[PDB]
Structures are given as structure tokens and as C-alpha cells.
């Protein structure tokens, strides 16, 4: 109920939410069905639109115009936005040469440089270059500010996860709102697009930037505009509020879009009909700068223009459905369109199995365009698993194609001509983002960057400690003219140990075996060095790794690689090598195909065996330091170490033995040298983050020994190509990725085929910032560099797409 009888006389657009079932004026109450019964008449106000005109200019005042330009609006804050370029003379904003903003040159009374956030739906990256002689307003921000050439959506590239990631610096798996339509089965209730559930607070998680602002002092306007409320009145009411009194005034602002992305759904993303979208749109940037300029706040208030996500083309004839794959279509629910998520119709089926859903679903049609995955099996870098609210299967869809149940679904539900929700690594999916005020850079490009990101930047622009969030705090430092963030390093937690030779070899009952009974004061004296780190700075080029939890674990050294062996793991956490250009590759010497050597460092106890391996049928071993780059055959020895080996399924050796034998030289040659970390990591329960010795599920048979969940490497040389990996004078250049470790290559429909033809493929679907290894193994990486802290905390959030030029 609400008694629609109270006034929005003086309360328009208030700041406060009045409690029911009492009227509300504020902004919201459009959505909530709760307005006073004046609220379009007083607050709604468009007689005679929104510019001033020369006949208009020194008018009486009448309360029922939109907008004014009588003498006393600049001091009433309500003159159209146009009022001093018609009445006075000036220039509109986006006429005036750009001129740096050294310092704030604020109004009296304002404490710190307001934050305004307008935020534009389905705006693709490529539009800023595109568009850009229809758009001169932006294109001024752009050129004269800070902008990236794209910003990278989180997934699914949908506009609730992405705004709600933009506000609170999480991925949706954490916030929870991982889709525009969700079903949590706790609350046993349904999030719509249409419809109230989706105002109910149980949804939101996190805390967004205007409940941080509001918990430390920091007054906010509104970030939900209803959509019936047109974008100049959204505008005027900006700048009303901005001519608040000090003790009122908000300090951060949102102004939102609908649009490129209405029209980019009907008419595609490069559409004929696209133009006027964008040129409405940079309208009302110039509105709002010209309203800036009128209040004396351009030079003032940082501005942000970004994007949710961007826009792909997508017709009703380019779907796929489960109806030709599924015997079974009605007993399942899917959640469709750009992605898919599949769950039992109903909870009392016990004839419902995912196991025979997947199978039916994998790899059935020669150009099949969607690939179906257990959550826990996705790429690490959507970080789209650990919520209740994400089904267990999950249908990653070819850009340009949705799925759907049933024909019937896409027919009786072409409209349409765009789309989005792919891969946020997807060309299309990118969007944009320019920062233009005194706190940021003056005409700077910077690379592009992700979506998580900005909501530490926003905290720093207003002076707020950031909640805790998925962002890394300082990366972003190189946006800023002033307000970094200067962090420190984290503490190394475990020291290690650096153990000599403990054990003789009658000591060891591993069941292993070595051919390397095969026999010198020049070689011996040479061979000690090489175990107590004499090429080390050779092979750690940037530091060990710190520890940062509570382990033990030893280093080990050899000619060839540096290792941090797990005593509670049984093998390596990283293990670090540089190969150069010049390096060659060699074969594994047939007399130690089966070669595996106790480690005279390492106690029997703390050592894997080979006869777990023997017994368990389905479980086989690799190598972390890969035999194929020995330095020297007798180096090569050092290889076959227990304390190198690591338990792997034979499928999964092929992808291991391709990149090891194959693509490290490949990257050491187009590079010019490459060190690689390479190690294990564990998340049996998904969320990200390193498993504890308690939550692993699945051990080499027999035996103590944990199953890895991925494998991972870091691959680093020198941004500048003409210096080595081992020599390198300035940036880095890294590429990483976290290969999951399963028992078949189903993955990959075309794995029958020589690796050459699937494996890179593979890798490159699961490409890594090293931030993602970094939480998935509790280890800090580059540690001990040249460069600037924050500098590599950019470095560290890095990923290497595969995709072509934006
Ligand atoms: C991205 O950044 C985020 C933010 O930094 C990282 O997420 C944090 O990760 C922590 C570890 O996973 C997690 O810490 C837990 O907090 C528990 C208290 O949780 C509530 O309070 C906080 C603070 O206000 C709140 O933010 C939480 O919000 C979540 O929950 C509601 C839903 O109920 C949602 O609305 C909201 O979206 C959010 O959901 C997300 O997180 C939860 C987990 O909290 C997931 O389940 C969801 O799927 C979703 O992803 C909560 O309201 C605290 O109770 C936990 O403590 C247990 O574990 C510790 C380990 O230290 C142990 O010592 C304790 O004994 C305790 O165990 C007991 O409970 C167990 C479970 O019943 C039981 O098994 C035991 O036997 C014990 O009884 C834990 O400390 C933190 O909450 C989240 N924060 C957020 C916002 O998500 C995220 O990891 C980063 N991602 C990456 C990849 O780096
Ligand atoms: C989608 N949407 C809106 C605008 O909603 C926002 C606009 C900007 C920002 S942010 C944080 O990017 O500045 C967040 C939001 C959420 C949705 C979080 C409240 N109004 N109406 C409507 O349908
Ligand atoms: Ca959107
Ligand atoms: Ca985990
Ligand atoms: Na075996
Ligand atoms: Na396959
Ligand atoms: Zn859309």
C-alpha cells in the first residue's frame, strides 16, 4: 500500500527514501508503483523543452517551464543547460581548446573534487573510433583525458553483473547477481528483469561504491534512474543537486544510459540506424559539460564514461537447439540465449543425471556452436563457478549464435539483429572507458584493463577505503595524476628450507628405478655448485615466489631449474627455468624412458613413489622442468627427480608433453628467451582460491599423494624483444595460463588429431593473469624486479588474449 495523498511539492528528486506506506518523491518511486499524486506534474516539468532559446533569454520566471533562462536561474541551479552560450555569449563546452587540468579549481565550499559516473549500456569498444566524428563531446574527453582503447566486462556480458561488478570491484560469482534471470534454490526465488523480486536487498551482494561512500561520510546521488524518466531531466537533476548547499551536496554521481544497446539489439551493432543513438548520446555528455561549465565545475569534478559490455551481431536464425541433441528436452530448464545454464524441471526426478546431459551434449555436430561444461570445468579467468546460483551446467556459446530449449521458444515467446553475454575475452564484448578531471592523467592512453578494477580507482577519487574486492589496489595507479595508491608487498608467511644431502639411496623403497649407474675433481667441484644455486640468477629471474600462508617446503637447486618443494604436497609449488633463444631441444634418452631418481635431499617420507603410479590405473606422472630443455645429458639426470615429477592422466600428458617439448622453444624463439614457472594447483571446491591440505578429493591411489585440479605457467621475457629474458633492462612481458587437469580431451572435439591441430587452442581458451595463479596458490610473484611496485601489480594483472586488433 501507498497513500498516494502527500506532496512532492519542494521534495522533488529528494535524496532520502521515505518509509511506506508514506509517498515517495525520490527517484525510485516511479519502479516501486509509490508516487505522490503530483510527482509528474511537479517534478516531471517539459513545458517548453530543454534549451533556451533568444526569445527566452531574461523571461520571467515560470515555475511550469522544464528548464529555465530567466536572470535568477544560475543562482536558482536550474537554468537550462544551454542558458550562458544563448543569453550570455559563452561557448559550449566542447568548442573550447583543451587545456590541462594541473590542480581542482573548485567553488568555494566544495571539500574534495566531486566523481561523476555516466555509465552508457552496450557500448563496444570500437565505437570511440568508429563514431567519433558524430561524437564530439566524448571524442574531447577521450583525446584530452585518460582513456584505454578498450576495458574488458566481466562474464556473462550482461548489464546487471557488469554494472553491479562496476559498483563493487566483484566478479558476479561473488556480488551474485550472475545473471540478468537467476534462480537462488535457498530462497526458493526467481530474479527477473521485469518485475519487483529483483529490488529485494537479498540479491546484492558485496557493498557498492554508494553504501561505501554513505558509511564513511560521503554523501551519494542516485545510481537506479527509473526508465520513464527522460535523460535531460536526469541531467537537470545532476545539477540541481550539484547547487545543493556544502552540507547536502552528494559527492559522487550517476547518470545511466539505456541506449547504444536498445537500438544495437534491433538494428546490430554497426546498424545504419546506430548513428543517431550516438549522436544522442553525446548530446547529453555536452549537455552535461555545458551544465559543468555554467556552475564553474568543469575544471572541477572527475568524470568517468564507461561501458558495461559491447554488442555482437546475433539473428533469430543463428540459434542452436537442445531439442536436437537431447532425447530428454523436457525434463530439463535452461537458461538461454548467449550463454546457457541447464538444472532438473523438477527436484523430485531421480531419473535427471548431468552425467548423460553433457555426454549427449558434447561434440555431436561437426560445426556444433556452443560447448557445454561442468562449472568447475571452465576457464579459471571467468572466475564463474562458486555461487549457488550458477547451475552445474553450463553452455559457452559461439560468438554470433544463441541456444535455445525448443523452436517453439524463438518463434512463440527475426526481431532482433545484436546480441550480447559471450566471453568476455570476445572482441565484440569490449566496452569503454575515458576518466577526464584534475585526478586524472592529461592526454594519456593506458593499456586496457578490466572492469574489477575501477571500483578501488573510485574509492581513491572520493578519499574512501575500498571494501574488500577482487580488484588489485594500485594496478590502476597509472590512470591517476594524484590519490595513489601506494601499497606494500605482502609478507612472506613460510621461510623455506634449503636442505643438503640428508639420505643415502638404500634408504628409498619407491619402487622407481633409474639407469643412471653410469660414471673427475674439474666436473665434481662444478656439479656441487649447480645444487647450492650457482646458476640460480640464471633460472629465478625475478626473485623466489614468496609463501604467503603457513607451509613447510624446501628450495632446491639445479644446473637447469629452481624448484619450492612441498613436504605436505609432495612435490613442487612453482618450479622456475629460463630457456634462451639458442636453446636446443633433445629427446628422452631411451634408457631412461621409465627413469624416475630419489632426491638425496628429501626424506623417503616426504618423497612420492613410483609404484602408487604402478597400481593406479588411470593416474600417469610428468614432469614440471620438462627433460626435452636439459642443458646437457648429464644434466638431463637432474630431471627424472621424484621431487620433479607430478601426477598426471595420460590425456593430459599429450596437451603437457606439446606444450613442453614444442611450445616452450616456440615462445624462447619468437621472444627471445622465456622463463617459465610452472606448478600444481588445487580448488576441488572451485571459489578461486588454494585449497588447504583437508579439501583435496582425489589422491593417487594408494598413496598420500594430492591430484592436481590445473596445471599452471607463467611465461615472462622482455617488452623490448632485442634484449634476452636474462637480460632484460625495462618492463616485462608475461603470458600465463592454468590448463585444467582432466582425465579425457573432450574438451577438445578435435583431439584425435595431432596436438599441433588442438593443443594451443586449448591453451589459449584458458589464458591467466597471474593475479588468477597468485590466489589459486597462495604465492607472490616478481618479487624482486627492477620496475616499480605498481607497475607490476599491472604486470600481474595481465592476460594475454588471442584475439585479433580492436
Ligand atoms: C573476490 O573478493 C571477495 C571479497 O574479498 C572474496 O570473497 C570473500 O571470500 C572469503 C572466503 O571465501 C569469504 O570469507 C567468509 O566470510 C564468511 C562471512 O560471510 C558473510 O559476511 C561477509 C562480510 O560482510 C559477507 O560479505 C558475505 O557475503 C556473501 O554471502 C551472501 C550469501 O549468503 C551473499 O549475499 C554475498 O554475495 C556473498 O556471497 C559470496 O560469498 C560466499 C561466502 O561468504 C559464498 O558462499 C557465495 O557463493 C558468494 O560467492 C557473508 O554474508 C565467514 O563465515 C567464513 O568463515 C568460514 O570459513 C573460515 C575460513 O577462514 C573458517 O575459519 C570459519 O570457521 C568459517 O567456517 C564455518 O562455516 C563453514 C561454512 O558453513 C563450515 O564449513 C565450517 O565447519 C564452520 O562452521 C569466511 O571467512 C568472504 O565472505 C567473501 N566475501 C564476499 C563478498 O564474497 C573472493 O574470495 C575474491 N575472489 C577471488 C577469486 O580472489
Ligand atoms: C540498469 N539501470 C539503471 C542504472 O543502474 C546503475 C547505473 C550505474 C551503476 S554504476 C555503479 O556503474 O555507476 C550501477 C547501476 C546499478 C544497476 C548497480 C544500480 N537505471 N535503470 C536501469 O534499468
Ligand atoms: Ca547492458
Ligand atoms: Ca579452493
Ligand atoms: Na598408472
Ligand atoms: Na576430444
Ligand atoms: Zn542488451
Same mark, same amino acid.
Given at each position: 500500500?501507498?497513500?498516494?495523498?502527500?506532496?512532492?511539492?519542494?521534495?522533488?528528486?529528494?535524496?532520502?527514501?521515505?518509509?511506506?506506506?508514506?509517498?515517495?518523491?525520490?527517484?525510485?518511486?516511479?519502479?516501486?508503483?509509490?508516487?505522490?499524486?503530483?510527482?509528474?506534474?511537479? @517534478?516531471?516539468?517539459?513545458?517548453?523543452?530543454?534549451?533556451?532559446?533568444?526569445?527566452?533569454?531574461?523571461?520571467?520566471?515560470?515555475?511550469?517551464?522544464? @528548464?529555465?533562462? $530567466?536572470?535568477?536561474?544560475?543562482?536558482?541551479?536550474?537554468?537550462?543547460?544551454?542558458?550562458?552560450?544563448?543569453?550570455?555569449?559563452?561557448?559550449?563546452?566542447?568548442?573550447?581548446?583543451?587545456?590541462?587540468?594541473?590542480?581542482?579549481?573548485?567553488?568555494?565550499?566544495?571539500?574534495?573534487?566531486?566523481?561523476?559516473?555516466?555509465?552508457?549500456?552496450?557500448?563496444?569498444?570500437?565505437?570511440?573510433?568508429?563514431?567519433?566524428?558524430?561524437? *564530439?563531446?566524448?571524442?574531447?574527453?577521450?583525446?584530452?583525458?585518460?582513456?584505454?582503447?578498450?576495458?574488458?566486462?566481466?562474464?556473462?556480458?550482461?548489464?546487471?553483473?557488469?554494472?553491479?561488478?562496476?559498483?563493487?570491484?566483484?566478479?558476479?560469482? $561473488?556480488?551474485?547477481?550472475?545473471?540478468?534471470?537467476?534462480?537462488?534454490?535457498?530462497?526458493?526465488?526467481?530474479?527477473?528483469?521485469?518485475?519487483?523480486?529483483?529490488?529485494?536487498?537479498?540479491?546484492?551482494?558485496?557493498?557498492?561504491?554508494?553504501?561505501?561512500?554513505?558509511?564513511?561520510?560521503?554523501?551519494?546521488?542516485?545510481?537506479?534512474?527509473?526508465?520513464?524518466?527522460?535523460?535531460?531531466?536526469?541531467?537537470?537533476?545532476?545539477?540541481?543537486?550539484?547547487?545543493?548547499?556544502?552540507?547536502?551536496? *552528494?559527492?559522487?554521481?550517476?547518470?545511466?544510459?539505456?541506449?547504444?544497446?536498445?537500438?544495437?539489439?534491433?538494428?546490430?551493432?554497426?546498424?545504419?540506424?546506430?548513428?543517431?543513438?550516438?549522436?544522442?548520446?553525446?548530446?547529453?555528455?555536452?549537455?552535461?559539460?555545458?551544465?559543468?561549465?555554467?556552475?564553474?565545475?568543469?575544471?572541477?569534478?572527475?568524470?568517468?564514461?564507461?561501458?558495461?559490455?559491447?554488442?555482437?551481431?546475433?539473428?533469430?536464425?543463428?540459434?542452436?537447439?537442445?531439442?536436437?541433441?537431447?532425447?530428454?528436452?523436457?525434463?530439463?530448464?535452461?537458461?538461454?540465449?548467449?550463454?546457457?545454464?541447464?538444472?532438473?524441471?523438477?527436484?523430485?526426478?531421480?531419473?535427471?543425471?548431468?552425467?548423460?546431459?553433457?555426454?549427449?551434449?558434447?561434440?555431436?555436430? *561437426?560445426?556444433?556452436?556452443?560447448?557445454?561444461?561442468?562449472?568447475?570445468?571452465?576457464?579459471?579467468?571467468?572466475?564463474?563457478?562458486?555461487?549457488?546460483?550458477?547451475?552445474?551446467?553450463?553452455?559457452?556459446?559461439?560468438?554470433?549464435?544463441?541456444?535455445?530449449?525448443?523452436?517453439?521458444?524463438?518463434?512463440?515467446?527475426?526481431?532482433?539483429?545484436?546480441?550480447?553475454?559471450?566471453?568476455?575475452?570476445?572482441?565484440?564484448?569490449?566496452?569503454?572507458?575515458?576518466?577526464?578531471?584534475?585526478?586524472?592523467?592529461?592526454?594519456?592512453?593506458?593499456?586496457?584493463?578490466?572492469?574489477?578494477?575501477?571500483?578501488?580507482?573510485?574509492?581513491?577519487?572520493?578519499?574512501?577505503?575500498?571494501?574488500?574486492?577482487?580488484?588489485?589496489?594500485?594496478?590502476?595507479?597509472?590512470?591517476?595524476?594524484?590519490?595513489?595508491?601506494?601499497?606494500?608487498?605482502?609478507?612472506?608467511?613460510?621461510?623455506?628450507?634449503?636442505?643438503?644431502?640428508?639420505?643415502?639411496?638404500?634408504?628409498?623403497?619407491?619402487?622407481?628405478?633409474?639407469?643412471?649407474?653410469?660414471?673427475?675433481?674439474?666436473?665434481?667441484?662444478?656439479?656441487?655448485?649447480?645444487?647450492?644455486?650457482?646458476?640460480?640468477?640464471?633460472?629465478?629471474?625475478?626473485?623466489?615466489?614468496?609463501?604467503?600462508?603457513?607451509?613447510?617446503?624446501?628450495?632446491?637447486?639445479?644446473?637447469?631449474?629452481?624448484?619450492?618443494?612441498?613436504?605436505?604436497?609432495?612435490?613442487?609449488?612453482?618450479?622456475?627455468?629460463?630457456?634462451?633463444?639458442?636453446?636446443?631441444?633433445?629427446?628422452?634418452?631411451?634408457?631412461?624412458?621409465?627413469?624416475?631418481?630419489?632426491?638425496?635431499?628429501?626424506?623417503?617420507?616426504?618423497?612420492?613413489?613410483?609404484?602408487?603410479?604402478?597400481?593406479?590405473?588411470?593416474?600417469?606422472?610428468?614432469?614440471?622442468?620438462?627433460?626435452?630443455?636439459?642443458?646437457?645429458?648429464?644434466?638431463?639426470?637432474?630431471?627424472?627427480?621424484?621431487?620433479?615429477?607430478?601426477?598426471?592422466?595420460?590425456?593430459?600428458?599429450?596437451?603437457?608433453?606439446?606444450?613442453?617439448?614444442?611450445?616452450?622453444?616456440?615462445?624462447?624463439?619468437?621472444?627471445?628467451?622465456?622463463?617459465?614457472?610452472?606448478?600444481?594447483?588445487?580448488?576441488?571446491?572451485?571459489?578461486?582460491?588454494?585449497?588447504?591440505?583437508?579439501?583435496?578429493?582425489?589422491?593417487?591411489?594408494?598413496?598420500?599423494?594430492?591430484?592436481?585440479?590445473?596445471?599452471?605457467?607463467?611465461?615472462?621475457?622482455?617488452?623490448?624483444?632485442?634484449?634476452?629474458?636474462?637480460?632484460?633492462?625495462?618492463?616485462?612481458?608475461?603470458?600465463?595460463?592454468?590448463?585444467?587437469?582432466?582425465?579425457?580431451?573432450?574438451?577438445?572435439?578435435?583431439?584425435?588429431?595431432?596436438?599441433?591441430?588442438?593443443?594451443?587452442?586449448?591453451?589459449?581458451?584458458?589464458?591467466?593473469?597471474?593475479?588468477?595463479?597468485?590466489?589459486?596458490?597462495?604465492?607472490?610473484?616478481?618479487?624482486?624486479?627492477?620496475?616499480?611496485?605498481?607497475?607490476?601489480?599491472?604486470?600481474?594483472?595481465?592476460?594475454?588474449?588471442?584475439?585479433?586488433?580492436?
Amino acid at each position: 500500500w501507498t497513500a498516494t495523498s502527500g506532496s512532492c511539492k519542494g521534495r522533488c528528486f529528494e535524496l532520502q527514501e521515505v518509509g511506506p506506506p508514506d509517498c515517495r518523491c525520490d527517484n525510485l518511486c516511479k519502479s516501486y508503483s509509490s508516487c505522490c499524486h503530483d510527482f509528474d506534474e511537479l @517534478c516531471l516539468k517539459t513545458a517548453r523543452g530543454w534549451e533556451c532559446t533568444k526569445d527566452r533569454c531574461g523571461e520571467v520566471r515560470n515555475e511550469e517551464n522544464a @528548464c529555465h533562462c $530567466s536572470e535568477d536561474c544560475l543562482s536558482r541551479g536550474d537554468c537550462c543547460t544551454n542558458y550562458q552560450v544563448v543569453c550570455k555569449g559563452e561557448s559550449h563546452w566542447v568548442d573550447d581548446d583543451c587545456e590541462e587540468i594541473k590542480v581542482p579549481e573548485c567553488p568555494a565550499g566544495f571539500v574534495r573534487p566531486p566523481l561523476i559516473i555516466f555509465s552508457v549500456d552496450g557500448f563496444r569498444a570500437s565505437y570511440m573510433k568508429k563514431g567519433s566524428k558524430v561524437m *564530439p563531446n566524448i571524442e574531447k574527453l577521450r583525446s584530452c583525458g585518460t582513456h584505454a582503447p578498450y576495458m574488458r566486462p566481466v562474464y556473462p556480458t550482461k548489464t546487471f553483473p557488469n554494472l553491479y561488478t562496476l559498483a563493487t570491484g566483484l566478479y558476479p560469482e $561473488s556480488h551474485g547477481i550472475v545473471g540478468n534471470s537467476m534462480y537462488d534454490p535457498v530462497f526458493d526465488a526467481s530474479f527477473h528483469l521485469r518485475g519487483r523480486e529483483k529490488f529485494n536487498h537479498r540479491w546484492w551482494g558485496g557493498q557498492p561504491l554508494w553504501i561505501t561512500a554513505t558509511k564513511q561520510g560521503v554523501r551519494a546521488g542516485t545510481f537506479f534512474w527509473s526508465v520513464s524518466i527522460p535523460h535531460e531531466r536526469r541531467i537537470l537533476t545532476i545539477l540541481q543537486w550539484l547547487s545543493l548547499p556544502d552540507n547536502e551536496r *552528494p559527492s559522487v554521481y550517476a547518470f545511466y544510459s539505456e541506449q547504444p544497446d536498445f537500438s544495437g539489439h534491433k538494428y546490430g551493432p554497426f546498424g545504419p540506424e546506430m548513428t543517431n543513438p550516438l549522436r544522442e548520446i553525446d548530446k547529453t555528455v555536452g549537455q552535461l559539460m555545458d551544465g559543468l561549465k555554467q556552475l564553474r565545475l568543469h575544471r572541477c569534478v572527475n568524470v568517468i564514461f564507461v561501458g558495461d559490455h559491447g554488442m555482437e551481431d546475433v539473428t533469430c536464425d543463428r540459434t542452436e537447439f537442445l531439442s536436437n541433441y537431447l532425447t530428454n528436452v523436457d525434463d530439463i530448464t535452461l537458461v538461454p540465449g548467449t550463454l546457457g545454464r541447464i538444472r532438473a524441471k523438477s527436484i523430485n526426478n531421480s531419473k535427471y543425471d548431468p552425467k548423460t546431459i553433457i555426454a549427449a551434449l558434447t561434440c555431436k555436430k *561437426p560445426d556444433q556452436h556452443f560447448k557445454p561444461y561442468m562449472k568447475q570445468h571452465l576457464p579459471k579467468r571467468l572466475h564463474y563457478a562458486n555461487n549457488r546460483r550458477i547451475e552445474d551446467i553450463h553452455l559457452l556459446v559461439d560468438r554470433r549464435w544463441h541456444v535455445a530449449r525448443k523452436p517453439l521458444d524463438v518463434y512463440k515467446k527475426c526481431f532482433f539483429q545484436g546480441d550480447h553475454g559471450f566471453d568476455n575475452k570476445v572482441n565484440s564484448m569490449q566496452t569503454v572507458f575515458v576518466g577526464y578531471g584534475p585526478t586524472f592523467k592529461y592526454r594519456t592512453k593506458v593499456p586496457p584493463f578490466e572492469n574489477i578494477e575501477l571500483y578501488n580507482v573510485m574509492c581513491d577519487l572520493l578519499g574512501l577505503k575500498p571494501a574488500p574486492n577482487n580488484g588489485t589496489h594500485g594496478s590502476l595507479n597509472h590512470l591517476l595524476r594524484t590519490n595513489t595508491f601506494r601499497p606494500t608487498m605482502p609478507d612472506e608467511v613460510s621461510r623455506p628450507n634449503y636442505p643438503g644431502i640428508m639420505y643415502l639411496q638404500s634408504e628409498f623403497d619407491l619402487g622407481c628405478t633409474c639407469d643412471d649407474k653410469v660414471e673427475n675433481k674439474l666436473e665434481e667441484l662444478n656439479k656441487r655448485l649447480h645444487t647450492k644455486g650457482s646458476t640460480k640468477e640464471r633460472h629465478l629471474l625475478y626473485g623466489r615466489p614468496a609463501v604467503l600462508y603457513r607451509t613447510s617446503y624446501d628450495i632446491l637447486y639445479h644446473t637447469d631449474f629452481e624448484s619450492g618443494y612441498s613436504e605436505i604436497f609432495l612435490m613442487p609449488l612453482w618450479t622456475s627455468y629460463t630457456i634462451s633463444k639458442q636453446a636446443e631441444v633433445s629427446s628422452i634418452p631411451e634408457h631412461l624412458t621409465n627413469c624416475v631418481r630419489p632426491d638425496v635431499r628429501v626424506s623417503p617420507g616426504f618423497s612420492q613413489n613410483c609404484l602408487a603410479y604402478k597400481n593406479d590405473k588411470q593416474m600417469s606422472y610428468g614432469f614440471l622442468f620438462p627433460p626435452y630443455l636439459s642443458s646437457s645429458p648429464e644434466a638431463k639426470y637432474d630431471a627424472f627427480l621424484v621431487t620433479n615429477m607430478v601426477p598426471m592422466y595420460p590425456a593430459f600428458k599429450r596437451v603437457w608433453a606439446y606444450f613442453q617439448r614444442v611450445l616452450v622453444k616456440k615462445y624462447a624463439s619468437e621472444r627471445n628467451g622465456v622463463n617459465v614457472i610452472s606448478g600444481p594447483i588445487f580448488d576441488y571446491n572451485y571459489d578461486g582460491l588454494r585449497d588447504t591440505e583437508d579439501e583435496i578429493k582425489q589422491y593417487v591411489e594408494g598413496s598420500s599423494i594430492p591430484v592436481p585440479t590445473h596445471y599452471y605457467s607463467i611465461i615472462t621475457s622482455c617488452l623490448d624483444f632485442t634484449q634476452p629474458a636474462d637480460k632484460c633492462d625495462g618492463p616485462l612481458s608475461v603470458s600465463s595460463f592454468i590448463l585444467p587437469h582432466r582425465p579425457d580431451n573432450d574438451e577438445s572435439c578435435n583431439s584425435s588429431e595431432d596436438e599441433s591441430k588442438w593443443v594451443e587452442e586449448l591453451m589459449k581458451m584458458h589464458t591467466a593473469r597471474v593475479r588468477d595463479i597468485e590466489h589459486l596458490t597462495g604465492l607472490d610473484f616478481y618479487r624482486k624486479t627492477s620496475r616499480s611496485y605498481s607497475e607490476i601489480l599491472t604486470l600481474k594483472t595481465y592476460l594475454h588474449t588471442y584475439e585479433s586488433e580492436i
